[PDB]
Design an enzyme around this catalytic site. Structure first.
Site, PDB file in Angstrom:
ATOM      1  N   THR A 159       1.498  -1.376   0.225  1.00  0.00           N
ATOM      2  CA  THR A 159       0.256  -0.095   0.109  1.00  0.00           C
ATOM      3  C   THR A 159       0.885   1.197  -0.151  1.00  0.00           C
ATOM      4  N   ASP A 261      -9.711  -3.125   0.445  1.00  0.00           N
ATOM      5  CA  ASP A 261      -8.335  -4.394   0.871  1.00  0.00           C
ATOM      6  C   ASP A 261      -8.641  -4.868   1.880  1.00  0.00           C
ATOM      7  N   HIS A 309      -2.693  -1.213  -5.645  1.00  0.00           N
ATOM      8  CA  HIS A 309      -2.318  -2.872  -5.722  1.00  0.00           C
ATOM      9  C   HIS A 309      -3.772  -4.169  -6.018  1.00  0.00           C
ATOM     10  N   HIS A 420      -0.864  -9.314  -0.342  1.00  0.00           N
ATOM     11  CA  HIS A 420      -0.615  -8.871  -1.089  1.00  0.00           C
ATOM     12  C   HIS A 420       1.035  -8.467  -1.726  1.00  0.00           C
ATOM     13  N   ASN A 685      26.999  -0.181  -9.249  1.00  0.00           N
ATOM     14  CA  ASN A 685      26.416   0.523  -7.782  1.00  0.00           C
ATOM     15  C   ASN A 685      24.389   0.192  -7.728  1.00  0.00           C
ATOM     16  N   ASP A 687      21.879   1.417  -9.261  1.00  0.00           N
ATOM     17  CA  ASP A 687      21.403   2.631  -9.618  1.00  0.00           C
ATOM     18  C   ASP A 687      19.851   2.710 -10.615  1.00  0.00           C
ATOM     19  N   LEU A 689      21.053   3.357 -14.006  1.00  0.00           N
ATOM     20  CA  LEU A 689      21.808   4.067 -14.227  1.00  0.00           C
ATOM     21  C   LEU A 689      22.819   3.517 -14.892  1.00  0.00           C
TER      22      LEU A 689
HETATM   23  C1  LIG Z   1      14.335   7.970 -11.033  1.00  0.00           C
HETATM   24  O1  LIG Z   1      14.473   8.879 -10.894  1.00  0.00           O
HETATM   25  C2  LIG Z   1      14.763  10.294  -9.909  1.00  0.00           C
HETATM   26  C3  LIG Z   1      14.869  11.259  -9.609  1.00  0.00           C
HETATM   27  O2  LIG Z   1      14.823  12.638 -10.834  1.00  0.00           O
HETATM   28  C4  LIG Z   1      16.405   9.815  -9.826  1.00  0.00           C
HETATM   29  O3  LIG Z   1      16.639   9.752  -8.799  1.00  0.00           O
HETATM   30  C5  LIG Z   1      18.151  10.725  -8.769  1.00  0.00           C
HETATM   31  O4  LIG Z   1      18.912  11.208  -9.373  1.00  0.00           O
HETATM   32  C6  LIG Z   1      19.764  11.372  -9.669  1.00  0.00           C
HETATM   33  C7  LIG Z   1      21.299  10.977  -9.866  1.00  0.00           C
HETATM   34  O5  LIG Z   1      21.733  10.185  -9.312  1.00  0.00           O
HETATM   35  C8  LIG Z   1      20.385  12.452  -7.991  1.00  0.00           C
HETATM   36  O6  LIG Z   1      20.944  13.365  -8.321  1.00  0.00           O
HETATM   37  C9  LIG Z   1      22.287  13.930  -6.759  1.00  0.00           C
HETATM   38  O7  LIG Z   1      21.676  14.475  -5.794  1.00  0.00           O
HETATM   39  C10 LIG Z   1      22.362  14.816  -4.677  1.00  0.00           C
HETATM   40  C11 LIG Z   1      21.453  15.502  -4.050  1.00  0.00           C
HETATM   41  O8  LIG Z   1      21.203  15.091  -3.479  1.00  0.00           O
HETATM   42  C12 LIG Z   1      20.182  15.405  -2.190  1.00  0.00           C
HETATM   43  O9  LIG Z   1      18.960  16.566  -3.094  1.00  0.00           O
HETATM   44  C13 LIG Z   1      17.917  15.956  -4.029  1.00  0.00           C
HETATM   45  C14 LIG Z   1      17.874  17.448  -4.535  1.00  0.00           C
HETATM   46  O10 LIG Z   1      16.504  17.449  -3.648  1.00  0.00           O
HETATM   47  C15 LIG Z   1      16.716  15.024  -3.450  1.00  0.00           C
HETATM   48  O11 LIG Z   1      16.143  14.701  -4.089  1.00  0.00           O
HETATM   49  C16 LIG Z   1      17.823  13.710  -2.565  1.00  0.00           C
HETATM   50  O12 LIG Z   1      16.709  12.950  -1.949  1.00  0.00           O
HETATM   51  C17 LIG Z   1      17.343  11.846  -1.916  1.00  0.00           C
HETATM   52  O13 LIG Z   1      17.861  11.435  -0.665  1.00  0.00           O
HETATM   53  C18 LIG Z   1      17.209  11.239   0.838  1.00  0.00           C
HETATM   54  C19 LIG Z   1      18.357  10.499   1.743  1.00  0.00           C
HETATM   55  O14 LIG Z   1      19.097  11.231   1.968  1.00  0.00           O
HETATM   56  C20 LIG Z   1      15.602  10.778   0.597  1.00  0.00           C
HETATM   57  O15 LIG Z   1      15.052  10.849   1.776  1.00  0.00           O
HETATM   58  C21 LIG Z   1      15.097  10.959  -0.562  1.00  0.00           C
HETATM   59  O16 LIG Z   1      14.482   9.371  -1.073  1.00  0.00           O
HETATM   60  C22 LIG Z   1      16.065  10.275  -1.673  1.00  0.00           C
HETATM   61  O17 LIG Z   1      17.040   9.731  -1.563  1.00  0.00           O
HETATM   62  C23 LIG Z   1      17.438   8.496  -3.159  1.00  0.00           C
HETATM   63  O18 LIG Z   1      18.026   9.364  -3.480  1.00  0.00           O
HETATM   64  C24 LIG Z   1      20.071   9.506  -3.156  1.00  0.00           C
HETATM   65  C25 LIG Z   1      21.150   9.112  -4.264  1.00  0.00           C
HETATM   66  O19 LIG Z   1      20.830  11.199  -4.262  1.00  0.00           O
HETATM   67  C26 LIG Z   1      20.314   7.678  -2.810  1.00  0.00           C
HETATM   68  O20 LIG Z   1      20.682   7.533  -2.015  1.00  0.00           O
HETATM   69  C27 LIG Z   1      18.552   6.713  -1.820  1.00  0.00           C
HETATM   70  O21 LIG Z   1      18.562   5.860  -2.031  1.00  0.00           O
HETATM   71  C28 LIG Z   1      17.201   7.001  -2.677  1.00  0.00           C
HETATM   72  O22 LIG Z   1      16.933   6.443  -3.624  1.00  0.00           O
HETATM   73  C29 LIG Z   1      18.819  14.588  -1.586  1.00  0.00           C
HETATM   74  O23 LIG Z   1      18.591  14.566  -0.461  1.00  0.00           O
HETATM   75  C30 LIG Z   1      23.575  15.326  -5.996  1.00  0.00           C
HETATM   76  O24 LIG Z   1      24.551  15.417  -4.083  1.00  0.00           O
HETATM   77  C31 LIG Z   1      24.463  14.338  -6.640  1.00  0.00           C
HETATM   78  O25 LIG Z   1      26.029  14.712  -6.976  1.00  0.00           O
HETATM   79  C32 LIG Z   1      26.523  13.850  -7.001  1.00  0.00           C
HETATM   80  O26 LIG Z   1      27.446  13.718  -8.144  1.00  0.00           O
HETATM   81  C33 LIG Z   1      26.820  15.028  -9.412  1.00  0.00           C
HETATM   82  C34 LIG Z   1      27.825  13.530 -10.456  1.00  0.00           C
HETATM   83  O27 LIG Z   1      27.418  14.662 -11.936  1.00  0.00           O
HETATM   84  C35 LIG Z   1      28.612  15.764  -8.836  1.00  0.00           C
HETATM   85  O28 LIG Z   1      28.161  16.229 -10.070  1.00  0.00           O
HETATM   86  C36 LIG Z   1      28.062  16.241  -7.942  1.00  0.00           C
HETATM   87  O29 LIG Z   1      29.552  17.277  -8.309  1.00  0.00           O
HETATM   88  C37 LIG Z   1      27.690  15.293  -6.401  1.00  0.00           C
HETATM   89  O30 LIG Z   1      29.331  15.139  -6.537  1.00  0.00           O
HETATM   90  C38 LIG Z   1      29.765  14.991  -5.210  1.00  0.00           C
HETATM   91  O31 LIG Z   1      28.827  14.062  -4.196  1.00  0.00           O
HETATM   92  C39 LIG Z   1      28.868  12.916  -3.886  1.00  0.00           C
HETATM   93  C40 LIG Z   1      27.888  12.167  -3.962  1.00  0.00           C
HETATM   94  O32 LIG Z   1      27.607  12.690  -2.164  1.00  0.00           O
HETATM   95  C41 LIG Z   1      30.675  12.569  -4.101  1.00  0.00           C
HETATM   96  O33 LIG Z   1      30.453  10.767  -3.922  1.00  0.00           O
HETATM   97  C42 LIG Z   1      31.467  13.283  -4.777  1.00  0.00           C
HETATM   98  O34 LIG Z   1      32.706  13.071  -4.632  1.00  0.00           O
HETATM   99  C43 LIG Z   1      31.121  14.956  -4.548  1.00  0.00           C
HETATM  100  O35 LIG Z   1      31.626  15.640  -3.764  1.00  0.00           O
HETATM  101  C44 LIG Z   1      23.425  14.003  -7.435  1.00  0.00           C
HETATM  102  O36 LIG Z   1      22.905  14.661  -8.412  1.00  0.00           O
HETATM  103  C45 LIG Z   1      19.310  12.564  -7.628  1.00  0.00           C
HETATM  104  O37 LIG Z   1      19.672  13.201  -5.560  1.00  0.00           O
HETATM  105  C46 LIG Z   1      17.868  11.404  -7.873  1.00  0.00           C
HETATM  106  N1  LIG Z   1      17.062  12.326  -7.078  1.00  0.00           N
HETATM  107  C47 LIG Z   1      15.916  11.396  -6.562  1.00  0.00           C
HETATM  108  C48 LIG Z   1      15.077  12.129  -5.779  1.00  0.00           C
HETATM  109  O38 LIG Z   1      16.064  10.323  -5.459  1.00  0.00           O
HETATM  110  C49 LIG Z   1      16.868   8.073 -10.129  1.00  0.00           C
HETATM  111  O39 LIG Z   1      17.521   8.311 -10.703  1.00  0.00           O
HETATM  112  C50 LIG Z   1      15.728   7.615 -11.041  1.00  0.00           C
HETATM  113  N2  LIG Z   1      15.768   6.282 -11.461  1.00  0.00           N
HETATM  114  C51 LIG Z   1      15.708   5.497 -12.433  1.00  0.00           C
HETATM  115  C52 LIG Z   1      16.207   4.004 -12.524  1.00  0.00           C
HETATM  116  O40 LIG Z   1      15.760   6.121 -13.563  1.00  0.00           O
HETATM  117 CA   LIG Z   2      -2.848  -0.790   0.050  1.00  0.00          CA
HETATM  118 CA   LIG Z   3      25.236   3.306 -11.695  1.00  0.00          CA
HETATM  119 ZN   LIG Z   4      -3.845  -5.000   2.134  1.00  0.00          ZN
END
Ligand SMILES: *[C@@H]1O[C@H](CO)[C@@H](O[C@@H]2O[C@H](CO)[C@@H](O[C@@H]3O[C@H](CO[C@H]4O[C@H](CO)[C@@H](O)[C@H](O[C@H]5O[C@H](CO)[C@@H](O)[C@H](O)[C@@H]5O[C@H]5O[C@H](CO)[C@@H](O)[C@H](O)[C@@H]5O)[C@@H]4O)[C@@H](O)[C@H](O[C@H]4O[C@H](CO)[C@@H](O)[C@H](O)[C@@H]4O[C@H]4O[C@H](CO)[C@@H](O)[C@H](O)[C@@H]4O)[C@@H]3O)[C@H](O)[C@H]2NC(C)=O)[C@H](O)[C@H]1NC(C)=O
Ligand SMILES: [Ca+2]
Ligand SMILES: [Ca+2]
Ligand SMILES: [Zn+2]
Ligand SMILES: CC(=O)N1CCN(c2ccc3[nH]c(=O)n(CC(=O)NCc4ccc(Cl)c(Cl)c4)c(=O)c3c2)CC1
Ligand SMILES: [Cl-]
Ligand code: NA
Ligand code: NA
EC number: 3.1.4.39
Length: 805
Positions: A159, A261, A309, A420, A685, A687, A689
């Site tokens: 859910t 459900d 679902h 489910h 990793n 992800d 991507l």
């Molecule tokens: C499906 O769609 C989604 C949405 O478009 C795609 O996910 C995006 O992917 C992007 C690329 O990976 C990613 O961009 C990164 O964001 C980093 C900033 O993160 C925060 O800010 C955003 C913006 O508001 C926010 O959305 C994030 O929220 C995540 O984290 C919190 C918890 O911490 C959660 O509450 C939330 O659910 C979400 O979690 C998910 O995402 C994170 C990763 O961001 C995962 O770890 C979790 O497991 C979970 O899945 C964040 O709060 C930003 O820092 C990154 O930038 C680094 O890399 C680039 C490379 O170009 C570079 O330019 C930068 O300088 C930077 O590098 C530096 O930092 C590195 C890491 O700290 C470090 O190692 C280096 O050495 C450098 O110093 C990057 O831009 C974007 O955040 C997510 N968005 C979401 C919502 O997930 C997803 O890919 C799609 N899926 C598919 C299959 O296509």
């Molecule tokens: Ca449900």
């Molecule tokens: Ca990858």
């Molecule tokens: Zn149920």
């Protein structure tokens, strides 16, 4: 501490929520048990029930009543939903013929059609047909509006993961709500369906529709509802909010039902006891629709009827117990049920070995009703890995079964007949979609689609620009009468090189050998035409894929196939070929068994080498274009170029070779030709991507040749199969896969038999959307067809599930 001694007078179901210690009057206060002392009295009136009767018509307004039948009630916005029917001889909405809604017909002051989301928990897709005789309101919505035969939920088919996907467009791995229960190792805390921990915002990522709305100046009703608020009061609250002054009125509304459900869990999906909850949901739909017709909003509002679902038969005696497989079952914690997630009981313990746990769970009983996976080996289509709240060890449980840790967990914690949470391709898990209103099409059936796509459409329906998400914007344009979003192709970032013959054989020091030196001007110009792209219209049917990141690569043409060869990863990113229905399979002649030939178009320094494969006792190699399908013994030499070679585990070659030698021919046979694009995927990793070069963790021993984690194929033909793939005039038909590149076949319990008994089963499991492959490769497919772009986007989101109907 809440000083709940304030009042809700004039604040019933207030839209903006007030900060403690001041008491609350919004639709959630009950869950925080922080309502003002008079909330029940003022806000949850129930006196005289929910419907007008003859004797109430024109009554003197009594403010104690649940709703009103008095004269002024329409202007107050608080009539009972059947007021007009009983007291003014109007007809129920369901009894009106449906008339197409060509334009929004909204009262003055409405700046845009409101959106109402009516979401129903556990509403299995087949209820639409099977329950049709008892859901006339829903059946009207369905046949008059736009509808899909079913909507695919996300995995796990629970859910909270599904409702928050609906609201965000994000996979659970990205939004954070990866289960109905889950443990975060960084928070060292657990989220559950029941309890207060779920209220903490730290769990909920992404940007849900209501925050998207608010940030862009569109007002949003609350999407969450406290369970104690009855459904009649939720509808009346929504209708009241709809009567608010223009500057205060929300533009988006959500109604949520706990049914069917709740009963489904008790009675199974088709228990005799299921008819009534379906009647009751339908009645609530009627109430909403009569409520809308009363306010003259019924040809103004867009209504989405959507489930999170479905529901399957599951009983206690179909439970597998981990205690039957492991001796050390007290060292683990299991998230039990319709999926399993296993982690160490005492965290930071170095005795715990995931590998030994997986092996104790693999193919141990002939009829085993679950399969263990490291999360990174799960089918890529589930997108269920990239979150620290997802345990490294996952169990995909068979439909109709449960997994539990020990028998005491089931008899000391039969209750249920329904559940489910299974794989989201499972029929019993599919759910419903109906859209009805001015912006949706009239009496239109659309193909099944995934619930990740709706956030974008809801944003369009509200004139919002969506936050980045996992939907493919434009892929559901065909649901809509008028589109605010015009999708366009991403621009190519790297243009290819077209190398010619630049190197002499003896410049190559690759340790490769081939038996190729067997001795005409006629077939000599002809061979050279092939190397320059003469057959390319035949093997590249939809234009070359676009490379959407910065890299260095070459287009290589051949009689039988074209490729995009990466100088960086030393292998093709894609290889494209067409196999007509007439084409024939041949063997690799014995003299060519271990043949690999230098490619004189590509420098030694950007080629793989045979020595590396010789030295790597684990790693063998394969070919992207299959030698088995060469068009002539002379063209077959092209298939052995070093530029068509890719690293492959011997275990994996069994899968690949059977696909190339048997299956491609069978599909060409069944589909009247097929075009195949195949290539490597690197996702170390997990992800979802494309990995950059500095992310690769495995290379062929002593080399710079990177080892792929997966191999994909995209198999395209003509949807009208009377037309051959290479001369297709209309829509296309596709199926794709992303196969894990694994050093053993432990996944396939039958792998010691002939490939014809297990290979196809495996590929089916790892079925994928083209769009999945695009994220994993950074390529863009189908750049040159005769089809509209929004039709191509729908095609790229298609998943061939292999379920029956
Ligand atoms: C499906 O769609 C989604 C949405 O478009 C795609 O996910 C995006 O992917 C992007 C690329 O990976 C990613 O961009 C990164 O964001 C980093 C900033 O993160 C925060 O800010 C955003 C913006 O508001 C926010 O959305 C994030 O929220 C995540 O984290 C919190 C918890 O911490 C959660 O509450 C939330 O659910 C979400 O979690 C998910 O995402 C994170 C990763 O961001 C995962 O770890 C979790 O497991 C979970 O899945 C964040 O709060 C930003 O820092 C990154 O930038 C680094 O890399 C680039 C490379 O170009 C570079 O330019 C930068 O300088 C930077 O590098 C530096 O930092 C590195 C890491 O700290 C470090 O190692 C280096 O050495 C450098 O110093 C990057 O831009 C974007 O955040 C997510 N968005 C979401 C919502 O997930 C997803 O890919 C799609 N899926 C598919 C299959 O296509
Ligand atoms: Ca449900
Ligand atoms: Ca990858
Ligand atoms: Zn149920
Ligand atoms: C992110 C955010 O703003 N908050 C703040 C509010 N929090 C919260 C507070 C009280 C709750 N009271 C309650 O009864 N329930 C049950 C309920 O409403 N179920 C239907 C439903 C509808 C929409 C969605 Cl998207 C989902 Cl997943 C579930 C909740 O889930 C619930 C959740 C969550 C974090
Ligand atoms: Cl769960
Ligand atoms: Na080897
Ligand atoms: Na096996």
């Amino acid at each position: 501490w809440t000083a709940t001694s304030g009042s809700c007078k004039g604040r019933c179901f207030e839209l903006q929520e007030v900060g403690p210690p001041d008491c609350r009057c919004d639709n959630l206060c009950k869950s925080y048990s922080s309502c003002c002392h008079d909330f029940d009295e003022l806000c949850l009136k129930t006196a005289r029930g929910w419907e007008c009767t003859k004797d109430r018509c024109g009554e003197v307004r009594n403010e104690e009543n649940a709703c009103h039948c008095s004269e002024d009630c329409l202007s107050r916005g608080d009539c009972c939903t059947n007021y007009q029917v009983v007291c003014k001889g109007e007809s129920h909405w369901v009894d009106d013929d449906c008339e197409e809604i060509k334009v929004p017909e909204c009262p003055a002051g409405f700046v845009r059609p409101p959106l109402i989301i009516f979401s129903v928990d556990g509403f299995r897709a087949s209820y639409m047909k099977k329950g049709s005789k008892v859901m006339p309101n829903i059946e009207k919505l369905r046949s008059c509006g736009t509808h899909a035969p079913y909507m695919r939920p996300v995995y796990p088919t629970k859910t909270f993961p599904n409702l928050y996907t609906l609201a965000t467009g994000l996979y659970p791995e990205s939004h954070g709500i990866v289960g109905n229960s889950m443990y975060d190792p960084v928070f060292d805390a657990s989220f559950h369906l029941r309890g207060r921990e779920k209220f903490n915002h730290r769990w909920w990522g992404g940007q849900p529709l209501w925050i998207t709305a608010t940030k862009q100046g569109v007002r949003a009703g609350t999407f969450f509802w406290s369970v104690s608020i009855p459904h009649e009061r939720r509808i009346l609250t929504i209708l009241q909010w709809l009567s608010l002054p223009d500057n205060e009125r929300p533009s988006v509304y959500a109604f949520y039902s706990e049914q069917p459900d709740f009963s489904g869990h008790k009675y199974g999906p088709f228990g005799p006891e299921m008819t009534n909850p379906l009647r009751e949901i339908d009645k609530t739909v009627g109430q909403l629709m009569d409520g809308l017709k009363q306010l003259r909003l019924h040809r103004c509002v867009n209504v989405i009827f959507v489930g999170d679902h479905g529901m399957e038969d599951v009983t206690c005696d179909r439970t597998e117990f981990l205690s039957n497989y492991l001796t050390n079952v007290d060292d683990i914690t299991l998230v039990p049920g319709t999926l399993g997630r296993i982690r160490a009981k005492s965290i930071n313990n170095s005795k715990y070995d995931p590998k030994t746990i997986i092996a104790a769970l693999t193919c141990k009983k002939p009829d085993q009703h679950f399969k263990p996976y490291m999360k990174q080996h799960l089918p890529k289509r589930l997108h269920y890995a990239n979150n620290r709240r997802i345990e490294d060890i996952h169990l995909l449980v068979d439909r109709r079964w449960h997994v539990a840790r020990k028998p005491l967990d089931v008899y000391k914690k039969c209750f249920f007949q329904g559940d489910h949470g299974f794989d989201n391709k499972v029929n019993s898990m599919q759910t419903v979609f109906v859209g009805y209103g001015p912006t949706f099409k009239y009496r239109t059936k659309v193909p099944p689609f995934e619930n990740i796509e709706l956030y974008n459409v809801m944003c369009d329906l509200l004139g919002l620009k969506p936050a980045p998400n996992n939907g493919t914007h434009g892929s559901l344009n065909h649901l809509l009468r008028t589109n605010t979003f015009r999708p366009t192709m991403p621009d190519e970032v790297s243009r290819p090189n077209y190398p010619g013959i630049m190197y002499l054989q003896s410049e190559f020091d690759l340790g490769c050998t081939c038996d190729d030196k067997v001795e005409n001007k006629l077939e000599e110009l002809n061979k050279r035409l092939h190397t320059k792209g003469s057959t390319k219209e035949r093997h590249l049917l939809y234009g070359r894929p676009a490379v959407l990141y910065r890299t260095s690569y070459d287009i290589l043409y051949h009689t039988d196939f074209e490729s995009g060869y990466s100088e960086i990863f030393l292998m093709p990113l894609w290889t494209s070929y067409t196999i007509s229905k007439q084409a024939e399979v041949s063997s690799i002649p014995e003299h060519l068994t271990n043949c690999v030939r230098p490619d004189v178009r590509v420098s030694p320094g950007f080629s793989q080498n045979c020595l590396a494969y010789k030295n790597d006792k684990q790693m063998s190699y394969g070919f992207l274009f299959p030698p088995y399908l060469s068009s002539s013994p002379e063209a077959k030499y092209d298939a052995f170029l070093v530029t068509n070679m890719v690293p492959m585990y011997p275990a994996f070659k069994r899968v690949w070779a059977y696909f190339q030698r048997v299956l491609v021919k069978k599909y060409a046979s069944e589909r009247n030709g097929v075009n195949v694009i195949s290539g490597p995927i690197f996702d170390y990793n997990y992800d979802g991507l494309r990995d950059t070069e500095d992310e690769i963790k495995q290379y062929v021993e002593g080399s710079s040749i990177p080892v792929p984690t997966h191999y994909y194929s995209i198999i395209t033909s003509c949807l009208d199969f009377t037309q051959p793939a290479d001369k297709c005039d209309g829509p296309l038909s596709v199926s794709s896969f992303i196969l894990p590149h694994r050093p053993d076949n432990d996944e396939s319990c039958n792998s010691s038999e002939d490939e014809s008994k297990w290979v196809e089963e495996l590929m089916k499991m790892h079925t994928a959307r083209v769009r999945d492959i695009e994220h994993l490769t950074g390529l863009d497919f189908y750049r040159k067809t005769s089809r509209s772009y929004s039709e191509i986007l729908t095609l790229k989101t298609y998943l061939h599930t292999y379920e029956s109907e």
